[PDB]
Write a protein that binds this ligand. Structure first.
Ligand SMILES: *C(=O)C1(C(=O)Nc2cccc(CN3CCN(Cc4ccc(Br)cc4)CC3)c2)CCOCC1
Ligand SMILES: *C(=O)C1(C(=O)Nc2cccc(CN3CCN(Cc4ccc(Br)cc4)CC3)c2)CCOCC1
Lengths: 804, 802
């Protein structure tokens, strides 16, 4: 078997090759369906959505016709909703009023469409909400109970503002803008760094969906909101500064407040009353580090929250009555009578609790039914805690008065607020997961008593949409077609769904499907294609898709991989191999989706003469908790076995794979594994290129690290064995084998990781290559040029093998 | 001619080679104290600082009245201090008090005063404090050695070492405050003055106490007070005030603490005094306080003041009568301003200009005042002939035409003093040295001045003496064949020389000075004793050859040549040019290069020709030679380097002109980048360590001296800033390697960072090594550099690789 040698391009030639082959718009999303209710007209529904038509991500609408010509294919045209001469990330809407609300740059704007006002046939001028606030307003939201009222965040404080009356009032005085960050670490209504980065919770305030009428003929509006104290939280610097909770250090001090807003009959503010918890957060919610999720019951009787312990191994869904909140009062005497005024019946309610020896994966599935009985609550939730696969469970929990009495002056026991479980029915089950993250949610038809959900049942390589009864769960009907991964949205009216779908051969597509029922059984569901929203571009002419492969592993699981065969393959000749790797939690690289946009350059590599290989090792997602839990406390210790195992699977089954000439490359967790690879399996991997790698888990945040690696105090040996900075001595003593790439201003994986590795590589007298991108298209081009040139001169080419 | 290829070693082999080949401060800050004991054997005790891996500390040696002139006396080092349960020191002849900082503490001891001479180590006595933070820059009051001053959290404090009384004199800085919020300091020299003018202290004791009626006294401290509020701020892995070229330097003034002491040495009172008119009014156009002190009797403070362009120097006398108590009360203040007579004016005793630049030095000697309207002093200047010579000046202290009471502002020449006389003491195509320890010692009895100079050669420093009265015969006291660094005893009967040459490691020796009985002004020297024996020629080290070549520019240029060891006939070798090439430095001279530049030898042992050349701009060749790159930094240095390379090559067939690398640090890293950028044909690889890449990112004091304000020099700043010219770099990799420390506070990493941005944006390849924070860093550097040169310049694979 002869070794193949890649063309040795000059730097100038490689640059040109890359510029020619290079020669990604946000596909429509945030769909909403509004009925036309016009019997004489041709359209059942208008859909609104966000999309890029190098453009503003903006609002569009399309017309859903009552009938189609089933001989032809209908392509909906995109009608601009706004009169435009930055972007719109998200929008808010109120059905009764037809009020849209959204941020675009510095301005909060609003418009009406689809309400009592009727339906525009032309773009609307966005109406700016006037403000006196110096700085940018963030995270605006319509009050669902009065669309004249919005809320927003200015300088880490909650404000409300009336789009009719022009009235603007600050609700919280927790922070002053002209201040030092060491001086002021307090914020209200804003989710802190760890909750954004590690739990994907972006908002920290929640309009109560219902009014309460005042006897005068006015009303009370309400805002549940998280208030955070970051005083005790590590501060770090980047070429400004922010509060980063390093693993094993302090997370922010947290609590629930409730802003109660009295409005008169003319819609002017009478008074604002900031309320606090009757007993400090730490008493009422023992053991709870993070507020993962919060909102309200549909009628606003209770607020709810999903609460986690620091070790993220215990989850509690808790009901919080507005009555548990008493005004913020200076005088002890006056304050003392308020606490007596609160009855002992008004206690917190833990409607659900679960635990695992692995970890809770937080998700966006939680549906509450209307309350049929004061003493009960009925809800759908998803959990891996029963079977080790995320499944939907319909639960009834009893709102028993607690044993604990505040009047007595004692402290509450652990299980004092636990609620009995009347009913806990599994709606789904199997060796596959319900998806509850990154847009994946459920839709509940309360009339037909059905629930639409996305899942891995047909294959862990493809997402499909499914329906099932939550009343007598059995048959799970798949609604999307096989041979594609789907990302779906269901109309609130549950008579339509939209799928964004693709596969390795074909670019993403967006289609609309009409849902029907046979007249004899409403619970049974069929789908018919209705219209295209976004036509697939079509197979890329210059792009050759990889083949998906699998192999039963010695670890007892199937492992899936992608193999990019060298273009123009020669017989008898063995080729140099590049392993591209992520291999960390919460991510799957290997699935039936178009990889031609993001991983187009794995194709470019194949074109130069490299075998390219990707493998989802254990710890990767869409394979259930047991498969994910394999590296718990042992990050870095197993992933490279699985990668090597798969590489030897392929090498015995194909002989164009030259095992003497394997390179590995990855960003973030991949950068980490690329370093671990050269360190542990020096005999397999000739070169390792580490992009922005984790090199020292003690330099990484609480929410992520402690979930997978525990508190460092109780896992020094795992933290040590998983930290490449601490094991510098194990790298090769010959150069041209280790390449480090890092953004200087990285705020997720600090440059700190790369510098601390560099000081330890120097102490250990080890060689290294480094590249830095100090601030942007120009950086990307330099990366790809440097990567291809490094692989050529140090792996692929003639001169590379001479160099040893 | 068949090309030599260096043995291709592995990383682990090279690391081992460096480690095998790898297998302490010389006596300094000397002082001579007379024994004054007729029956005893010794004339003098000498105190000095030295290490014998060890703490730098105080030692003394015994100078014998006589020696056996057949033998060689090695002085033995007696430790003066007892180990505690030192970088500098102060001394007070009359009392024999030593004062010095050792770690966090200020200690003191007595030797050689009335209390006599110890025969054993003394126990350092701690100066007790209530101050939370570390005390800096302790100094004895020359008027009363019970009192010291020191700096604490950027304010001046005093402390009596007998009474233990402690008092803060200035209230300018709040320690517990944001560094951006509080930017005032007192008695402390700011970044640019330490870093670009080597002034380290910001306050000066008046050397005399004025007696009061009560039997008490008044002690005086002149101090600088700085406001750094408008100065740019930069942050490193805290933050500090860095004046970027063309931006604001600190706001500066003179202040004076009057300290009333009673007859038992208790502080009665402390009065803070400010200039009667602001600094900007009294000293028009002055930006920098370069130097300051007192006249020997304490009648005047003195100062050497520079303009922003560093082309005007003034020496100014400042009477204490010029300061008034700080009074926020308008009525009181006006009354105080009226009470100070118009006859009391700053006296500019000297003023000079140049179209090149002023070079600040440490030479300034004031003679005892013999008349009230005359001051007699010795200064040094390049401004008359373009070489630094000593001038004896007498200036007339007339009453000024400006009268404060007329409510006007003074005109630019109102404070200028007539020059009664200006006499050259030295002259010639050579310079008096006045920096890095070089100064004069004036003998006021025999009317002679000892000084250091390049008179005999630009490659050797020598000690010289000459009369300052009928200047003529300059006598060389040090011996030819060595570069010397010297200190003269205050009694002027001895001198010490730390000397070396290319072949021999540094040595320190004591010489006795004598006069023939018939002429005290004639001076001879006799060897007396060795203070530190030379290690002897290094066994493993092979000294380079000093060469020179007559440049087309019309100057002799000097270089050093390391011939490749075990030289083969008919074979040509790869050449490493090592470079600094910048102002204020000379790499090529007759000194031992076996410590600092030992690795240039290692290179030659591996089969590399090594070249070093002092291009124009380098020092010790006078102001005209230095002035070559005025406004044009980066545009001429590499021509000289290449001229000397081409010269060596057309004389030696063993230089492979097709395989030249260049390497340096700082200015040398700059020129290494400039080299590959302008002379791509000559240089295969540039290794740039801590390069300046953007002249607007460097400081005021240095950059504006050599390049002026950026507005006056758009083209020089552009052409001299390599980061502005990233597109002129090679498109082929393994030619450019950058080395930087992330924490550099002189050449910020920012220079490397901005360069990388433009290299990326221009699609250019580069290599990078970083030292994040320590002897392990140096070893890795040496290891990466030798291996890099092997792989990419001098080995067989290197030739193949192209
Ligand atoms: C890690 O999580 C994180 C990071 O991912 N950083 C990062 C930096 C730079 C680029 C990317 C995107 N990535 C997309 C896939 N490409 C594959 C590839 C391209 C080109 C070639 Br020639 C081969 C393979 C690589 C680049 C991601 C993000 C969070 O913060 C820390 C850094
Ligand atoms: C520039 O002025 C400055 C600087 O000099 N930095 C610096 C950093 C690290 C080391 C040195 C010491 N330098 C001594 C001379 N060596 C000669 C040599 C050694 C080894 C080999 Br293999 C060849 C030649 C080189 C290193 C100096 C200091 C001021 O601030 C900016 C950085």
């Amino acid at each position: 078997l002869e070794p193949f040698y890649v063309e040795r391009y000059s730097w100038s030639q490689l640059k040109k090759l890359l510029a020619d082959t290079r020669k990604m718009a946000k596909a429509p999303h945030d769909f909403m369906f509004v009925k036309r209710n016009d019997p004489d007209g041709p359209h059942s529904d208008r859909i609104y959505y966000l999309a890029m038509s190098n453009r503003e991500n903006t609002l569009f609408y399309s017309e859903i016709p009552k009938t189609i010509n089933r001989a032809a294919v209908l392509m909906l045209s995109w009608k601009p909703l706004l009169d435009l001469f930055v972007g719109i990330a998200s929008y808010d809407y109120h059905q009764g009023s037809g009020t849209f609300l959204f941020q675009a740059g510095s301005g909060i704007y609003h418009v009406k469409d689809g309400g009592p006002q009727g339906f525009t046939q032309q773009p609307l001028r966005p109406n700016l909400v006037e403000t006196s606030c110096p700085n940018i307003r963030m995270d605006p939201k319509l009050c669902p109970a009065d669309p004249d009222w919005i809320a927003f965040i200015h300088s880490n404080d909650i404000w409300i503002s009336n789009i009719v009356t022009r009235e603007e009032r600050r609700l919280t005085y927790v922070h002053n803008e002209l201040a030092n960050m060491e001086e002021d670490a307090r914020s209200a209504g804003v989710a802190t760094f760890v909750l954004q980065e590690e739990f994907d919770r972006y908002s920290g305030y929640w309009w109560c969906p219902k009014a309460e009428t005042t006897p005068s003929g006015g009303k009370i509006l309400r805002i549940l909101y998280e208030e955070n104290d970051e005083s005790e939280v590590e501060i770090i610097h980047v070429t400004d500064s922010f509060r980063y909770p390093k693993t094993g250090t302090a997370n922010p001090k947290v609590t629930f407040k409730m802003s109660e807003i009295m409005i008169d009959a003319e819609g002017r503010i009478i008074d604002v009353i900031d309320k606090e918890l009757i007993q400090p957060f730490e008493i009422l919610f023992e053991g709870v580090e993070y507020i993962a999720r919060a909102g309200w019951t549909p009628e606003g009787k209770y607020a709810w929250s999903i609460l986690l312990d620091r070790s993220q191994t215990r989850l509690q869904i808790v009901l919080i009555s507005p009555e548990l909140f008493i005004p913020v009062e200076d005088d002890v005497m006056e304050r003392q009578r308020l606490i007596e005024s609160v009855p002992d019946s008004v206690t917190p309610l833990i409607i659900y609790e679960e635990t695992t020896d692995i970890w809770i994966n937080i998700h966006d599935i939680f549906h509450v039914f209307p309350q049929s009985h004061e003493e009960e609550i009925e809800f759908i939730f998803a959990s891996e805690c029963k079977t080790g696969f995320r499944h939907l469970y319909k639960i009834t929990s009893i709102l028993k008065e607690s044993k604990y009495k505040r009047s007595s002056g004692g402290l509450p026991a652990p299980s004092d607020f636990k609620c009995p479980i009347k009913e806990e029915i599994a709606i789904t089950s199997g060796e596959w997961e319900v998806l509850g993250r990154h847009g994946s949610n459920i839709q509940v038809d309360e009339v037909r008593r059905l629930v639409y959900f996305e899942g891995t049942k047909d294959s862990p390589l493809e997402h499909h949409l499914y329906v099932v009864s939550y009343v007598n769960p059995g048959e799970v009907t798949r609604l999307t077609d096989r041979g594609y991964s789907h990302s779906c949205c269901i109309s609130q009216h549950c008579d339509f769904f939209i799928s964004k779908y693709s596969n390795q051969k074909n670019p993403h597509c967006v289609s609309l499907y009409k849902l029907s029922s046979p007249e004899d059984d409403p619970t049974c569901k069929t789908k018919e294609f209705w219209a295209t929203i976004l036509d697939s571009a079509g197979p890329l002419p210059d792009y050759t898709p990889p083949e998906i492969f699998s192999f039963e592993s010695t670890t007892g699981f199937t492992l899936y991989g992608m193999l990019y065969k060298p273009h123009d393959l020669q017989p008898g000749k063995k080729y140099p191999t590049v392993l591209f790797i992520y291999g960390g939690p919460q991510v799957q690289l290997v699935n039936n989706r178009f990889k031609g946009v993001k991983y187009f350059r794995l194709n470019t590599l194949a074109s130069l003469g490299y075998v390219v290989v990707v493998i989802d090792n254990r710890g990767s997602c869409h394979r259930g908790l047991k498969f994910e839990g394999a590296f718990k406390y042992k990050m870095g210790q197993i992933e490279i076995d699985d990668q090597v195992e798969g590489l030897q699977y392929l090498a015995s089954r194909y002989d164009f794979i030259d095992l003497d000439r394997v390179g590995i490359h990855g960003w973030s967790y991949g950068g980490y594994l690329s370093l671990m690879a050269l360190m542990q399996r020096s005999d397999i991997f000739r070169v390792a290129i580490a992009g922005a790698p984790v090199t020292l888990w003690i330099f990484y945040d609480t929410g992520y690290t402690e979930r997978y690696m525990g508190h460092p105090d109780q896992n020094e040996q795992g933290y040590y064995l998983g930290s490449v900075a601490m094991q510098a001595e194990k790298f090769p003593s010959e150069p041209n084998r280790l390449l480090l790439l890092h953004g200087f201003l990285d705020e997720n994986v600090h440059f700190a990781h790369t510098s601390i590795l560099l000081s330890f590589l120097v102490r250990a007298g080890k060689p290294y290559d480094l590249q830095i991108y100090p601030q942007v298209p120009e950086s990307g081009e330099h990366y790809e040029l440097h990567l291809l040139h490094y692989l050529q001169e140090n792996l692929g080419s003639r001169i590379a093998a001479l160099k040893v």
